[PDB]
């Protein structure tokens, strides 16, 4: 049968979501046109139901998640409320997209598994980066042994939306609500590194806060309570030596996420700023033409082609929510997918919290 | 009233079209959903439509001209069958959404034209590149003086699809079907120029036949009547003074359209390989910090926002057919749009035919 | 015998030919030092001469081509006094070392020539860029059929130091003086072409008049009878068909050669604001991993080595110059070197005259 | 009076000495010719000793380091003979001219001090890379508040010359010889930090042995005793937050040195690989035209100006042991300088030992 979409909150992420539940099938091609059934958020939810084609509205999501007709749940609200509609959607025996992260507090996380290991439907998150096919291709040169035994990599991600110290304090700053950095960026990269290679075993942080404070919307200043900036050592599965930043305060970085990988027979480059290339080193052939490749995101690195048929004409931001969204169907009848599970999620999770106490506790931590 | 939409072709460029109109209400939010009513192909046509999402396959072409519940005719097909088809779309009083070049021949052209001006509706050409947020605000800029008044202007673009000498000799190198690299490409510089700049006045043409002949499918050899490479020296409306390079032979470049444009107090560099990109130079404040400004896309460079919150992120070549299919719309309603027009594509092409006469002749021609 | 050597000119390239002969043994090791004897200038000479370490200053020009103990001749002046320079050299029995061009009117080079083809000496012309380990590399590369049959090649050389419109008028803006754009810059890429190519067969030229006139220093403005861009169609030996672009009017190009090379099997681009790199893109191996390699100098890309041992590094402009002298003192005792004679020098400054001709004639010409 | 050089080893950092104290005056200007007097190496010290252009050879080092006409040692051997040498010379009453490191042990190193603070002459170190206009250009922006106040700095300093695992072992892998990457590599980097901020203050290091043993070339394997990679997170003066990644087996890196500077008002960029440029952002002016600067090294970036009069044309890797014995010069008579001594140097070695400990004992250390 087609599938039924319910999708919850309409910001950015809902906008994404729904671009990519009406675009599946016209891209990819082998699977059911799925059907936007509900739609959820004041009755504003009337207003974006007409905007992105949904049939019904509602301002009650446990109605939604009721709902017979829906088949899975896109889950798009803020951070707080994933545990509790993730859940309440699993138990009433549905499939869940879930933006990241899974919730602020490990025991949270752990219950939204529990769940969905006991429920019956699939589960995934949206860590999106993982399925741009210059990625995959990433993948499979670094699986052929292309660059030989990856020794050393080192991972960036940065923006600058919390550059300017004079923006109004709001949620992002409140520790109660995420760590920063680590809560918002890191798990990004780590999806990454666990696409490539797989999860992080030991740690050691520095973080900052390079703003003691921040105004108030309302009048007077708030402490930051949070930390903007994290610089992570790390050791992944099988010895892999790691370095990881995340920074939100870094000027002039707008989609920053740099990837450098190094092995004994060569390297390769990636930068999300450019999305549509990475650079290949290999130590092969004549040393007077040795060099890096840049290389362009092309019809050969499936599934390019069912978007484009010429190569160097790019991907967008988008583009990798419909590819995400296509893997989510093929678990739900896995077939093999590649997907992130609440249950690599909780792991990546994990990860996150052995950095902050890494830093708290000034020590190593292994996980 | 939401148009109901009829689409003939369904290669990589139909699909193109699908796209687009499948999601332009998604993105944009300000326009009825348009109804996807008429598919045509071949035999394929029933399957096609089950993915791109429409009601009606027929294998008629036009039976589709003729189904009262369309409004709008999507012409994606060969370059030959695109006059007959825009014609018996316009005299049967449909708008028409048409892939370019208009036609081979200036006449062919010429008369689409006056069949449409003299028709009651709104015909588009293809121009795509024009609509990119990055190239809307590049107008901007040169429109507020921020470079000064221009003089100099060079655009490149490169593809190596017909690089590999020793690929089978088809369509695309037969005289009949088009001078080659001036029509397939230079048109889209040219709607560039036209874009920014206007029309042009003067040209003078090379014209490069990379090699002699390419072996045939079933056995042999034919001679290559076209040319995979051309390059103009320009004059445009009050003599800015500019250079055209157009080339498919060219390994390595794969979507490369690529643009330098200098005044008198700064430049523009932009290169389609980076299409969410471009660089700024300004005359002003101290010298030792002058240079190029590399400016990201980002949400304040319109309609950039309608598609993602973030700078930094990048759109894909394919929301440029999303931008253009919201801006025929517009000039459905119309309302000032920025399409290009029928009327300005024949200019283009009168351009086009000029450029190859400068060759042929090997003297100047003005236009 | 080590050569001792006169100089005359203390400009900011008087100073690169002390530097050069100053430092070519200590670099090359196979040479003999070169002794200072002479230097020539207004009454600067004697403390110049402190600094470029020569033994006797004096400001007349003739006592230097008169000292005995002088056996070559640096000529590094305004262009107006090389030819008759040159020649109270080449006459009086010395070897020259001379600054581009060979002079403003073809016949007072074409007298160049033959003084110097009569006399007995070694005649070259400062085309440093020639000299680029990479440059030479290039060369190797294209001779190897590295890239196949090269049909197509863009030439673009770039700078700014006439783009401020407010610019009191001064000689570079006189048509007595020079053709502007052509004689100033063209030569360099016409050197470079010659280098890896031949010389050019056929022109045609469009100019670019910027700014109609400039500020006067001491009050008022004149016209300016020159042209600061230039752009040039050509042809070569053996039918590549080229492009030129020169232009001292482009905001933010600071020192900027750019070099397209394209051929049957592959691409080379260059650009000489990163002189120390190229790329190189050979169309073989598996086509999900082609691209442009990244090639850094590097001492296997002679004479390199003879400069720093590692990778990556870089030369400096002015190791060009030392370069450059080495040749000239292979010439001397000569056996084949890389040097450009006067023989070619005027084919060169053929090519430029017929590329102004073109411009003002409206028409292709041929050489 | 003119100084009087005494030069110590002739491998490549010999050359790089001889040929700065060659040129510094020409280049310069306003400084006594340095004269190169007595040469140290088996009796090929004669040989080189005509090819850099010194008076006297010999094979004694306490010979040179005797000799009355020297006023100053360049000592350029390998590391182990530092301490030995530059303290004879310095007791000698000489000033020194030092390659890095000090010594590959603290108390050698402390020895070294002792001495040269009792001793009467300079002593500096070649931190070239400190030297470069651009940095100093960096310095300065910094020093003007022009980013506002650094919060984080990332520094990275890459090669590959260890990258190959076939090399046979030789020094660069016996632990007494040095601790690797840390020794060799990370120094530079501190060096930079030190002259834009300052001296390290807590450290916490991860090191990477690739390959555990490599061939002898007389037969057989070693294991590797050293570490090829390191990972360092710091604190600076100032409470800044600095990582930093040192690696010698970084395949095609060739003279990689990263720096990202992060603060409240902006961001610089700065890659070693193309020297003479950097890129600076400014959170400053109209949102929609913000981004990086690529600014290119130019005569406003003192003291670019005394080797080039245009912008854009490029310094080399030599060119920066020029300036440094300028500055090393400026000391001598001091005269304020930008030099490394031995007392700053030192201390950047206490940064290398701390880090290694921070390795072995698995913990923060402070400093």
């Given at each position: 049968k ?33 059907r936007?059934?509900?739609l ?6 009337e ?7 949904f049939?019904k509205?509602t ?16 889950v ?7 545990a509790?509609?993730?859940i309440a959607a699993?138990?009433?025996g ?21 769940t969905?290991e ?6 995934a ?19 052929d ?7 050393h990599?080192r991972?960036?991600?940065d923006?600058?939306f919390?550059?300017?110290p ?9 520790l109660?609500?995420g760590?920063?950095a680590?809560?918002?960026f ?13 999860h992080?075993?030991?740690v050691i ?8 404070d921040?105004?108030?919307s ?11 900036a ?10 892999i ?8 305060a ?5 989609g ?17 700023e ?8 290999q130590a ?36 990798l ?9 093929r ?19 994990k990860?996150?919290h ?8 000034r ?5």
């Amino acid at each position: 049968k087609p599938l039924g979409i319910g999708l919850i909150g309409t910001g950015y992420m809902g906008k994404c979501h729904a671009l990519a539940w009406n675009a599946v099938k016209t891209v990819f091609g082998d699977v059911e046109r799925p059907r936007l059934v509900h739609l959820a958020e004041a009755g504003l939810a009337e207003a974006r139901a007409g905007e992105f084609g949904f049939e019904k509205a509602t301002a009650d999501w446990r109605a939604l998640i009721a709902d017979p007709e829906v088949d899975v749940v896109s889950v798009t609200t803020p951070n707080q409320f994933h545990a509790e509609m993730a859940i309440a959607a699993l138990e009433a025996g549905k499939h869940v997209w879930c933006e990241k992260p899974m919730a602020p507090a490990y025991a949270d996380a752990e219950r939204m598994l529990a769940t969905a290991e006991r429920s019956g439907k699939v589960a995934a998150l949206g860590y999106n980066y993982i399925q741009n096919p210059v990625m995959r291709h990433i993948r499979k040169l670094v699986g052929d042994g292309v660059i030989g035994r990856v020794n050393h990599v080192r991972v960036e991600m940065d923006e600058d939306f919390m550059a300017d110290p004079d923006i109004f304090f709001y949620w992002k700053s409140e520790l109660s609500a995420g760590y920063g950095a680590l809560d918002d960026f890191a798990v990004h990269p780590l999806s990454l590194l666990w696409y490539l290679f797989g999860h992080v075993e030991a740690v050691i942080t520095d973080m900052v806060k390079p703003y003691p404070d921040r105004p108030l919307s309302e009048g007077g200043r708030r402490a930051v309570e949070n930390h903007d900036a994290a610089n992570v050592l790390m050791r992944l599965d099988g010895g892999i030596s790691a370095v990881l930043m995340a920074n939100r305060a870094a000027w002039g970085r707008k989609g920053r996420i740099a990837l450098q990988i190094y092995g004994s027979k060569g390297s390769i480059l990636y930068d999300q700023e450019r999305m549509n290339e990475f650079e290949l080193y290999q130590a092969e052939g004549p040393g007077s033409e040795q060099g890096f490749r840049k290389i362009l995101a092309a019809p050969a690195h499936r599934p390019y082609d069912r978007f484009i048929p010429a190569p160097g004409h790019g991907l967008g931001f988008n583009d990798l929510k419909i590819i995400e969204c296509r893997e989510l169907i093929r678990a739900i009848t896995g077939e093999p997918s590649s997907i992130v599970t609440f249950k690599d999620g909780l792991r990546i999770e994990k990860s996150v919290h052995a950095m902050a106490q890494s830093f708290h506790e000034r020590r190593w931590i292994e996980i």
